């Protein structure tokens, strides 16, 4: 099918089978300083996006289910419209403004169950 | 509820550095990573994306590159700091025309040899916009003695530009605005996603845009403000116009040795007629050209506005020609001959020639160009032109340009840098 | 207006088997999970199978467990029962129906829909 | 024992009790940039390797056993003779042919149970 | 409350709870050789606590619970002592000399059950 970002313009329910599509593609002295800033800047931002999915329990998947529950003040929609109608560009737009709380959530909502996982040992 | 998803095609707007790419240059040798021979492109059904060529950083990038790709070529040639002395120049009268009557100067003077206590009297031509007289009615000196130092340029380095194709970092990705009737800014639909641009190759000139990329239907006005009068207007022809460039002079070269290990490359006595260097426009062509550049211009200004073509403004020559670097000289040459009408075989446009060159618009760095021998013919497509606008019934258009960065925003328009941002979350109906 | 039309043999021996077919029409088949129910000739509704919207998915109820099969094929909008072994008990109208599970990424169900007319089946 | 690489002409099932030893060998400015790059490469690798193990699911381990069936023509053998006879060199260049198209299979049934796990929560 | 390195005086069982606090703070050519140096350092460190992390079977994890015995040679002390009055500091310094003896018990143990879990599969 298409490749990379080919499902940019496709439902979010459409797109979101793709994951590995975009995954794979995140990876004279003074043109060897550019392009390793280039290559070492690729991997320090691939490395924070792993570090936080490993803080939320989410390390070495694709697809994430947590258990935090949505607050309908976040975006107020049905998943019929979320999954089957919006894009994934249109939905980072509507719901930025909360990408900083939610992911507090999720940071706090894996620090305790790591912890009543130990006392369950 | 909270599902975390990673992988996700969202991107947003992004600066960063991108690499060269491509299939004894200047610019791109060795230092340039070899490209994809099947590249890829993605059709990205249903995406629109908002696209403004004036504000994009691919064009500062591009600009920084080539300019300092172009000092490091010379960082390891000949300096002529002995060269700065006084000559003693007469004229060149054997078998000149009428057209270059004191345009060429032969000047003799007492240059440096490999040993440092001797001297060698040597002679070599100059072109009067070279020299400068002083004081002794013969006596003359270089052009840039009393600005800055003066290198050769190393006469196995060509200057012919080889395409670059410009490439994105991981993470990243450059989109790519299909869009035919594309202005430059707003949105558009038919975006693709690239590797790679295409190659682009580092053409300097003035007024004339020269073998660059063709509009696809039909000739395109692009302006950052058409109503701005202190604005610039990129043409872009969907059809070009053939100009043939010619210095019709059989030059030789010779070798003065200057110091141990070095050289200079003198112009020597020119064999056969001296005659004046010219470009040749094909009239029907320019005409015919010319008459599609107005029929757009008048779907800014008026369908009854009366729309003229003048010669460009005074000031320094390198702004007032057209100037351009081909078979390895640098040409200024006159287009008052190209504009100059109302609304809408051949045309002759005479040309100087230059040795001393100062690139870009700096002051400081002046380079020398090594005379090429035998006889230079050039052959290159007119792709667009830049165009200033003079300014209740009638609007005057005249050449302009100068500042490179308008040489490669029009072949960079189509393309916006994005960086990827694959998380997202979303509500779905599952429980951890 | 949607179909769900069941064929399959109606008559076989105990210690046997008998495959049942539900063609399926009017509607995206493949948005939707599917399941069986039976019908005692003189009893009530008991549920048999499900099987999820993609057919990577399928349950049963305990009393078929070790025995039937539930498939679907998405190309030719069918489902497929395949029974195993039978039982006396077995005897029953087999409904193909319309429902019963969701996708987790839409609405839940949790109901059926759309039933057929149902497949008989005797178990001699 | 033996270290990095002793294992090399040891049969396959001798070897794999050995991963951990290479598993932790992978880890005047144009000196500067020549060690850079080469460093730089070293990380980018590794990473390359960790995705891919990721993507199959198989992040955290040195031995995974995946869901994708054995196809007899990549290499009609017994396990007597692949973990009893061969060694990993003779055996990569047997299958080396092979190795994309298993890769393939490896990330689809990756796909398709990680979206099954989430139908079942 | 108090961000990095705040808990460092409070005792290990009241720390131990910021341990995402730390964890997300590890992260003219001559000063571009020297920053991509520091950048490039960075990152291998991080690196090599992951793989370590990785091959005792805690890939993942904050806290991870393992299948190795405490020998009382190394501390014999109770759970009070050391999780109650002991800073991370103090504790530091008081097992120095056994690191390495627990890093290769963690590593074998791991190697180990790794094994068991394909026999039962
Ligand atoms: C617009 O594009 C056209 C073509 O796409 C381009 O014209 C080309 O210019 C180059 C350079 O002037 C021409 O190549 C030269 O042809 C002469 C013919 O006698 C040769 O002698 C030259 O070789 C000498 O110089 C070389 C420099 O490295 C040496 O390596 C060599 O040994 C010789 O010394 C050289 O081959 C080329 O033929 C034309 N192309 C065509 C089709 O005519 C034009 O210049 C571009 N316009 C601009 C403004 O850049
Ligand atoms: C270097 O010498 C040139 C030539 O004499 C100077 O340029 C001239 O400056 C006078 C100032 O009134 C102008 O009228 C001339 O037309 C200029 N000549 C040219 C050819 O442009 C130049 O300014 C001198 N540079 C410095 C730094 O003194
Ligand atoms: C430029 O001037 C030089 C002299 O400075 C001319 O060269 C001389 O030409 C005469 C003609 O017979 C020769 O006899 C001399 O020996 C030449 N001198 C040298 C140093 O070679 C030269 O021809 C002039 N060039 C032009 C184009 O006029
Ligand atoms: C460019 O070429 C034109 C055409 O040959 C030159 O035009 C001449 O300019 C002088 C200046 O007053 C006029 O008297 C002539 O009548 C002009 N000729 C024509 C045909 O118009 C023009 O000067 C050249 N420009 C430069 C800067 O040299
Ligand atoms: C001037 O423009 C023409 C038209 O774009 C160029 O000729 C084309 O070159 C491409 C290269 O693949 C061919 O596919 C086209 O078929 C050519 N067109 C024609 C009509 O032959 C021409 O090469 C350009 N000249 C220069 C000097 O670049
Ligand atoms: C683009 O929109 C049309 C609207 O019907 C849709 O059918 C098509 O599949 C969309 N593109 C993609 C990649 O889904
Ligand atoms: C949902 O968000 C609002 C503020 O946007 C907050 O007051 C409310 O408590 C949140 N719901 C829950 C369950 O915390
Ligand atoms: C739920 O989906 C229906 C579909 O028409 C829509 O009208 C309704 O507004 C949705 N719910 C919310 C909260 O918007
Ligand atoms: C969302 O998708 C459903 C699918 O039937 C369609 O009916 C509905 O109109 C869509 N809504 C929007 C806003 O496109
Ligand atoms: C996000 O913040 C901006 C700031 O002006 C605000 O305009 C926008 O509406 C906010 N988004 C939402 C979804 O409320
Ligand atoms: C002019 O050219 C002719 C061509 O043969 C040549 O003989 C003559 O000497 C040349 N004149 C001068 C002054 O060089
Ligand atoms: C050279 O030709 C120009 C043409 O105007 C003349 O003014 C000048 O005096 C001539 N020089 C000599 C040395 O004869
Ligand atoms: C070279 O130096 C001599 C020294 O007497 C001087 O006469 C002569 O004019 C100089 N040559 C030039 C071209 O200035
Ligand atoms: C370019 O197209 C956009 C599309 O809306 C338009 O707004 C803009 O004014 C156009 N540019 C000019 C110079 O008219
Ligand atoms: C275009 O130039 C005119 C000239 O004054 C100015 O008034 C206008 O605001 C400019 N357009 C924009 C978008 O600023
Ligand atoms: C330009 O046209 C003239 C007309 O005679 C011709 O002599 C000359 O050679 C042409 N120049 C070029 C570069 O073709
Ligand atoms: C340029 O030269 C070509 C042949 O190389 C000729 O056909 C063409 O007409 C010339 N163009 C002009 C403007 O003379
Ligand atoms: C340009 O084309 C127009 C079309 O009518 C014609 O009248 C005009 O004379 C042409 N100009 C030249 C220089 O051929
Ligand atoms: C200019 O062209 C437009 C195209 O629709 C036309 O409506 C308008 O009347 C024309 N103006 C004149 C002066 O003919
Ligand atoms: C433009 O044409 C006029 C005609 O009188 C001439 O005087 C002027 O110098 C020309 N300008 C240039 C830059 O060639
Ligand atoms: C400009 O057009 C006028 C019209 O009479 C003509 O006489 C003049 O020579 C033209 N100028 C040039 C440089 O061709
Ligand atoms: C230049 O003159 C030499 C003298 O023999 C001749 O061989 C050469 O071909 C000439 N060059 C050209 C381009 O005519
Ligand atoms: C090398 O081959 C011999 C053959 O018997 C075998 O015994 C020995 O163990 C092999 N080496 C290793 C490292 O296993
Ligand atoms: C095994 O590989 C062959 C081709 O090498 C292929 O045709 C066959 O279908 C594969 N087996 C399975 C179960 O897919
Ligand atoms: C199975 O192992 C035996 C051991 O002798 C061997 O002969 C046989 O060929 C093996 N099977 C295959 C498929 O080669
Ligand atoms: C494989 O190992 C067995 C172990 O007994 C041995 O008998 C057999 O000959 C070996 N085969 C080869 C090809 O070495
Ligand atoms: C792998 O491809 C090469 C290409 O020639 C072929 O010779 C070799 O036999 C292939 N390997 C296998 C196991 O078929
Ligand atoms: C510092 O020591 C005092 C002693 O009572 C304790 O209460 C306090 O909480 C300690 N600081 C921290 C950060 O716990
Ligand atoms: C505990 O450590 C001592 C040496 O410090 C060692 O001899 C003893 O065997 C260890 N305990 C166990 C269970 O291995
Ligand atoms: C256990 O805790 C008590 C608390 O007072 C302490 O006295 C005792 O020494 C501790 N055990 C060890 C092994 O030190
Ligand atoms: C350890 O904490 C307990 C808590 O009650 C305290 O009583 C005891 O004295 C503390 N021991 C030390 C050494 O601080
Ligand atoms: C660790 O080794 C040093 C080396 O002198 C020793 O002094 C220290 O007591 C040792 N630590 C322990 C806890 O035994």
């Known amino acids: 099918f298409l490749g990379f970002l080919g499902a940019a313009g496709s439902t979010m329910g459409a797109a979101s089978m793709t994951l590995t599509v975009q995954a794979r593609n995140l990876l004279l002295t003074v043109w060897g300083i550019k392009q390793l800033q280039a290559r070492v800047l690729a991997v320090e931002r691939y490395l924070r996006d792993q570090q936080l999915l490993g803080i939320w329990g989410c390390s070495g998947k694709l697809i994430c289910c947590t258990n935090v529950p949505w607050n309908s003040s976040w975006s107020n929609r049905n998943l019929s419209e979320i999954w089957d109608n919006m894009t994934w560009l249109q939905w980072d737009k509507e719901i930025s403004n909360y990408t900083q709380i939610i992911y507090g959530l999720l940071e706090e909502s894996q620090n305790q169950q790591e912890k009543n996982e130990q006392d369950l040992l | 509820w909270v599902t975390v998803y990673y992988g996700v095609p969202v991107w947003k707007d992004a600066e960063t550095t991108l690499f060269c790419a491509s299939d004894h240059n200047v610019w791109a040798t060795h230092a340039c990573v070899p490209t994809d021979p099947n590249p890829q492109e993605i059709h990205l059904e249903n995406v629109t994306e908002e696209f403004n060529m004036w504000k994009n950083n691919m064009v500062e990038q591009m600009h920084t590159d080539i300019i300092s790709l172009w000092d490091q070529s010379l960082k390891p040639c000949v300096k002529l700091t002995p060269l700065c002395v006084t000559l003693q120049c007469t004229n060149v009268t054997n078998n000149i025309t009428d057209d270059m009557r004191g345009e060429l100067k032969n000047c003799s003077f007492n240059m440096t040899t490999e040993l440092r206590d001797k001297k060698q009297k040597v002679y070599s031509l100059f072109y009067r916009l070279d020299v400068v007289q002083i004081n002794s009615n013969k006596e003359y000196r270089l052009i840039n003695c009393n600005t800055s130092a003066i290198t050769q340029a190393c006469p196995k380095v060509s200057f012919e530009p080889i395409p670059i194709h410009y490439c994105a970092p991981a993470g990243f990705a450059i989109l790519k605005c299909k869009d035919k009737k594309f202005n430059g800014t707003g949105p558009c639909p038919s975006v693709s996603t690239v590797q790679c641009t295409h190659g682009i190759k580092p053409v300097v000139s003035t007024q004339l845009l020269l073998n660059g990329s063709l509009a696809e239907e039909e000739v395109m006005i692009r302006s950052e403000n058409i109503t701005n009068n202190a604005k610039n207007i990129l043409v872009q022809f969907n059809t070009p116009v053939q100009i043939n460039c010619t210095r019709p002079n059989n030059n030789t070269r010779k070798s003065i040795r200057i110091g141990p290990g070095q050289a200079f490359y003198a112009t020597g006595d020119i064999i056969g007629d001296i005659r004046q260097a010219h470009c040749n426009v094909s009239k029907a062509t320019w005409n015919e050209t010319l008459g599609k550049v107005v029929k757009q211009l008048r779907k800014h200004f008026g369908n009854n506005t009366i729309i003229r073509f003048a010669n460009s403004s005074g000031g320094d020559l390198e702004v007032t020609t057209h100037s351009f670097n081909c078979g390895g000289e640098f040409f200024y040459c006159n287009t008052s001959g190209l504009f100059n009408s109302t609304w809408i075989d051949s045309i002759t446009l005479p040309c100087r020639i230059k040795q001393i060159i100062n690139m870009w618009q700096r002051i400081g760095q002046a380079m020398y160009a090594p005379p090429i021998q035998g006889v230079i013919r050039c052959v290159s497509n007119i792709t667009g032109l830049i165009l200033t606008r003079d300014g209740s019934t009638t609007e005057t258009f005249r050449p302009g340009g100068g500042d490179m960065r308008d040489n490669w925003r029009s072949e960079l328009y189509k393309y916006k840098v994005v960086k990827i941002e694959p998380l997202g979350v979303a509500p779905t109906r599952c429980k951890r | 207006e949607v179909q769900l039309v069941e064929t399959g043999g109606g008559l076989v021996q105990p210690g046997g088997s008998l495959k049942l077919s539900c063609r399926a029409s009017?509607?995206?088949?493949?948005?939707?999970?599917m399941s069986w129910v039976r019908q005692a000739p003189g009893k009530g509704l008991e549920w048999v199978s499900l099987?999820?919207?993609?057919?990577?998915?399928?349950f049963y109820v305990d009393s078929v467990k070790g025995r039937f099969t539930i498939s679907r094929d998405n190309s030719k909008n069918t489902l497929s029962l395949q029974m195993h072994s039978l039982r006396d008990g077995d005897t029953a109208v087999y409904y193909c129906?319309?429902?019963?599970?969701?996708?987790?990424?839409?609405?839940?169900?949790?109901?059926?829909?759309?039933w057929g007319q149902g497949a008989l089946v005797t178990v001699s | 024992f033996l270290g990095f690489l002793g294992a090399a002409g040891s049969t396959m099932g001798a070897a794999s009790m050995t991963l951990t030893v290479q598993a932790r060998n992978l880890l005047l400015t144009v000196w500067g940039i020549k060690q850079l790059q080469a460093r730089v490469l070293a990380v980018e690798r590794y990473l390359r390797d960790q995705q891919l193990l990721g993507i199959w699911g198989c992040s955290g381990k040195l031995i995974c056993c995946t869901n994708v069936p054995w196809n007899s023509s990549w290499s009609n053998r017994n396990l007597s003779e692949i973990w009893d006879n061969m060694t990993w060199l003779q055996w990569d260049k047997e299958i080396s042919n092979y190795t994309q198209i298993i890769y393939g299979l490896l990330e689809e049934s990756q796909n398709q149970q990680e979206k099954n796990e989430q139908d079942l929560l | 409350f108090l961000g990095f390195l705040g808990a460092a005086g409070s005792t290990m069982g009241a720390a131990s709870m910021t341990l995402t606090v730390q964890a997300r703070n590890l992260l003219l050519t001559v000063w571009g050789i020297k920053q991509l140096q520091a950048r490039v350092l960075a990152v291998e460190r991080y690196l090599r606590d992951q793989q370590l992390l990785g091959i005792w079977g805690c890939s993942g994890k904050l806290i991870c619970c393992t299948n190795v015995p405490w020998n009382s040679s190394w501390s014999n002390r109770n759970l009070s002592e050391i999780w109650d009055n002991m800073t991370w500091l103090q504790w530091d310094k008081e097992i120095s000399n056994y690191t390495q003896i627990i890093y290769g018990l963690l590593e074998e143990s791991q190697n180990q059950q790794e094994k068991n879990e394909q026999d039962l599969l």
């Open positions: 009017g509607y995206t088949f493949s948005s939707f999970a």
């Open positions: 129906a319309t429902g019963g599970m969701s996708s987790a990424l839409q609405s839940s169900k949790y109901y059926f829909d759309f």
């Open positions: 099987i999820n919207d993609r057919g990577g998915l399928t």
